[PDB]
Amino acid sequence: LMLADAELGMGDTTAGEMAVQRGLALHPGHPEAVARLGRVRWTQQRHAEAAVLLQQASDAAPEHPGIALWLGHALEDAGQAEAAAAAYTRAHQLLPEEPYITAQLLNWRRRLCDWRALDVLSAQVRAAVAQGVGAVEPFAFLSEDASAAEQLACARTRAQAIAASVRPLAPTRVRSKGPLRVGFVSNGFGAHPTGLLTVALFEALQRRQPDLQMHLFATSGDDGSTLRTRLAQASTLHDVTALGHLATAKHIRHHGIDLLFDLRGWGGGGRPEVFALRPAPVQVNWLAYPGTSGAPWMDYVLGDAFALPPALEPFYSEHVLRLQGAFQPSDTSRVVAEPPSRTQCGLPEQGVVLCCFNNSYKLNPQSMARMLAVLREVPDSVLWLLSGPGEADARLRAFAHAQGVDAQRLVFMPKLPHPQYLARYRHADLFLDTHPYNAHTTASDALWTGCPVLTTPGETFAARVAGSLNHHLGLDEMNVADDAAFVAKAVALASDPAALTALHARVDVLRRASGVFHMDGFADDFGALLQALARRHGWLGI
């Protein structure tokens, strides 16, 4: 059992199982034992079986904390959202002081739009980051009202834990001579944000920057998307799913990558330990983790003048590089299809449709309140949202009612295949952004379909992304100072269709004319920046 933990700790789940099972062989029905078995299952990804057992073991010892949290982990990944929440609750009841349970609880509550004791929970996670302690996940922490400084703190602490338990590969340099090898590590190469944002760029680079060798290190297998196949077509895609961290790192070294981009990085399925092994001489943070890595192994972050302005530099560990337009490319080959009718989409046939298709953890009391206030001031408006996990949708219905709006004014879109979800935007009149974690991919999606995005650019990179897209498009009037200006601008537009029509017209002009959706230009800018970076590190060219 002690043995079994070490065996499980090591990775040998089968030997782990064998040990545990002999443990149970002694006292059948025992909490401490029954739980480890369920943890084997969880590790083995037999997630429904993990939860049966941890429920047996939880029920026999309603008081171990310990076991409660582990049952949460298992119920989370088994898609039993509300029950996983109820388990983290208990684990928090038993140990209110442990800023490792609180962090997992808070995050799971944001994702279910459960806001009980939110501020008290957030404070305790922020306290934990200020001493950290250290538990706290930098991705989850993005959802909090913390400053750039606090996110950095959270990220270092997490980075230090990794850098301590890893020995870097032998240092190497950028080749002085020959075509530059450029590498990108992601689990999202396919029908995922990363694949979706980068695909038209890679095809543009393949055509326009022949002196750069693109390499994609995919930490996920083929999902059968046209994205994965296009990405494969436009580069050398290496499937490294199932290689451990070190073998992944060695495989990047084997290919002699000069510049290596981390697309995810604190992400969730991200392999930051691969970066921690420094397989490439220059390592860049870009695009799909909207914050600092906080990490000694990351040389650079790639941003832009708006989303990462001079006043944000003190709060990055990386050195800051900027593109000449927005940091964010997108799939400009996408023909947005026509949606079903409004009725077929749950929408009324008349009425202004305000929408926000953001992830549930981005929808907080502040972002919701201000969307709801727009609805109160605009008679026949409707609010169109992504349907969310567990009972998320019902909690927002109750909150709308509490905020003095008819709950039936909220329409919840089920998750759709990307081409179908994209088409939904043609029914939307205005996209209402979230704070402090902006719409990112979803804002690019919205604008590409022709739907304007209203945002309140904040003080962190993650609260400035929507506003960068507006800024680089020329839509400055859609970046407003605060909640009051937000509700006012939206109300102004929603209650005057002629101005609204003019705005859609304006977005169409600016869509075609600005550099924002010009992936050829993006490729030339990106490539030139890569080349100039490489010469700064001794590349002589060719």
Ligand SMILES: O=c1ccn([C@@H]2O[C@H](COP(=O)(O)CP(=O)(O)O)[C@@H](O)[C@H]2O)c(=O)[nH]1
């Ligand atoms: O019904 C849907 C809903 C969402 N998306 C896609 O879900 C993704 C946005 O999800 P994220 O919040 O994890 C990524 P971000 O925070 O970096 O912006 C995009 O790929 C959307 O096109 C769909 O394709 N269909």
